[PDB]
Design a protein around this ligand. Sequence first.
Ligand code: ADN
Lengths: 287, 334, 210, 56
Amino acid sequence: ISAFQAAYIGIEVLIALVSVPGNVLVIWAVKVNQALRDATFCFIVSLAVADVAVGALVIPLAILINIGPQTYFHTCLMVACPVLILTQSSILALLAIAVDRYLRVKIPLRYKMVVTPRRAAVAIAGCWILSFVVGLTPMFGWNNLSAVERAWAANGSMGEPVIKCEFEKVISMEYMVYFNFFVWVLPPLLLMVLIYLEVFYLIRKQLNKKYYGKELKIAKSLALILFLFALSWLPLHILNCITLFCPSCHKPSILTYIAIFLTHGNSAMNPIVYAFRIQKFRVTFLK
Amino acid sequence: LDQLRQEAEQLKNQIRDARKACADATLSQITNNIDPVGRIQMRTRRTLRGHLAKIYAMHWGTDSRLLVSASQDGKLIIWDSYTTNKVHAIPLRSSWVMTCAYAPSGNYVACGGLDNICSIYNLKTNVRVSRELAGHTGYLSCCRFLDDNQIVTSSGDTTCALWDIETGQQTTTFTGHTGDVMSLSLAPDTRLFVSGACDASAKLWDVREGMCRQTFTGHESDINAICFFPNGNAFATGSDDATCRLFDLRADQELMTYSHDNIICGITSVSFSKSGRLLLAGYDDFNCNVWDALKADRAGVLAGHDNRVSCLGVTDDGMAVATGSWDSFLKIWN
Amino acid sequence: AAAERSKMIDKNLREDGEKAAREVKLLLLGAGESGKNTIVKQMKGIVETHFTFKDLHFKMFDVGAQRSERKKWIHCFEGVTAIIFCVALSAYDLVMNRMHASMKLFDSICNNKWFTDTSIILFLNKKDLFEEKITHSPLTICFPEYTGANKYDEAASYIQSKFEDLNKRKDTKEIYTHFTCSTDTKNVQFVFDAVTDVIIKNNLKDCGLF
Amino acid sequence: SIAQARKLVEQLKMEANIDRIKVSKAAADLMAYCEAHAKEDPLLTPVPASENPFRE
Ligand SMILES: Nc1ncnc2c1ncn2[C@@H]1O[C@H](CO)[C@@H](O)[C@H]1O
């Protein structure tokens, strides 16, 4: 329908087709083995079902929204809001892993008795209910229902509005910048870097108390984790920001597209970086 | 001293000749004519969950419904296998147990291991220790009830012993093994038993005279498991050399070997089905292989565990096989 | 009901199964006459010793009493947190040598199929009895290939290097060597520090960081 | 050392004098047991679902 749009679709299709098999393989290897039923694998399969849902539902929904089929307004809210719910759940699952990996080094002796797998499930369920609220906030009245009905009435029609549905048309940008980014994406990013900087001190302190190579490998593992999260979510959110605060700031179209697939791309890199590094997890996949 | 021992070796030469003399045929060619059974597909009907460490032994009750299991978490659990209900969970004084047994009356269980003590527990008093049979100088590796009154035990100290539970004394000792005894099996008529040891020999013992009538060699390494054929005139052994062998009492020699080139791991447990046709054996490769005992072809595999099958047993009525494993689960199959 | 009995018993299993899962289990292995007894005096068939130090319950199993073959019961201790190995330094000349017999025993437990991932706490004993007796006899009786000054500092560090370098699994298990002291606090404190380091490194291997 | 060792020989003497049966008779008895009890073996010849206690 357009050269740039067609390119974006193909990238999305392959992101989906690499996000759904790897993540179900994480869920498969968790369910077939019984040595992966402790506290930290609960958080990992929570991340896994979040990211496979991305590759399952978010990617087709995102492709459909981009193509813009003409749709009634309340119908487009129930299409656009599952993109918000599922992607947010990925972010909060990532945050939950980091708190788990922080407790392994802050309280290592009484770790097993404090974060018991029963308490893991309440925190996982807590992440998901917070994911659903942030996603369903547009349907509760924080949307462009106000702005669209003025434009509809001007050309003369009446009833319920029918628009070429695009994400910037039904979801207001003061929601995305002030509530999605500044409350529910930016504090999770900053809590991760504070948790992981603190983790690196405690790990380094123990090692000092042949060792330089392990310390640099641990720092390389932590850096890669933080950079991939900060490379995914940050560009798309900044583009939303400079669309709100600078309304006349013109930016190209394929820039906006390229940001979106990076956000989806995180759901593909999650099993490679998180589960494929664990030795117990890797060996039941190889065998 | 040397010439006297070779004189015993001179006796060994005629014994080999005498055993060869009566090998008029092979079991394989005698049983060549029958149709083979073909693939047998037992599915797991129950998973018994609740142990929190490796399971080392199990034993069916004679009612074919209750079973007892022993694990390194210090718990002896009696399961109602039909409903998956736990009937009793007995807390063990020492958690390093290696064997358990169910009394035929159902009133008693026995258990022991690296503590060198065989503890007898009265189930029909909650469950309390009724006797601690002391006297072995190695780990207790196996124990079996002749009846409520009497229990035969085997030990790493190279002896087996028959105990009178009421008085707590060894009534007869069975010496003659030259390595730690790993397993024993009571004859159906309970007047004889066989023992398996790490000297690669099995020995048939007479309970009332208390000495070894016959010794069966042929294995090249440790015998971990042993089980009578259901008519009591033959038995099968399981060894670390990845083979099982069937030995006949009256023919006093090996009759059949059960092995594949593609199985190289040790055998941990063996049992016959009710009719004797199937010999089921548990392997270090996490699987149980089902052999046709008459024709030595492998009939099937039971692959449902993530660690060694350490114990198994077939019900008295023949209806089911239970397998217990180091991965902390028991499964019931038929 | 019968399922009520099943559920009540299952509750006691989960209760007692976590109460006994917060206790560090330490297999204690040594040679005959190697000085195992002095370590157990400080801290208070198979013999189980239970002591609590700094809110950590330690179960230490002295299994040296068993005269049976090791290969038949060593898989029962696959889940022990660490292995405490006691070596008598004074026994480098006594009796085919006693120190050579202990090095072959050490090389069996360290390169075992079950103990690939289990760290070894190594205790060298009688460093005072070793320090005085080292001048009347060289280490060439025990270790011929030794080319060092015959003083306690150099000799002890060579014996520790011989015992350590028998670790072929240099990446996954670590040998912590401490020369035992007569004061009770120091030896138990080292055991707690070694157990703390192995527990932290076990947690790190489950993240994927280590 | 000889006197303690010699006692094994009398056991070997006991094993030496027993009568052994030919494999042809011995093996025939085992197959005869298996064929006669084929109908009482639920693992050899599988039972219907309803009769089976574990999964009726
Ligand atoms: N400006 C935007 N245009 C289109 N989709 C957007 C925009 N901002 C965020 N999204 C969507 O929101 C999700 C993140 O909450 C992303 O998966 C992305 O598809």
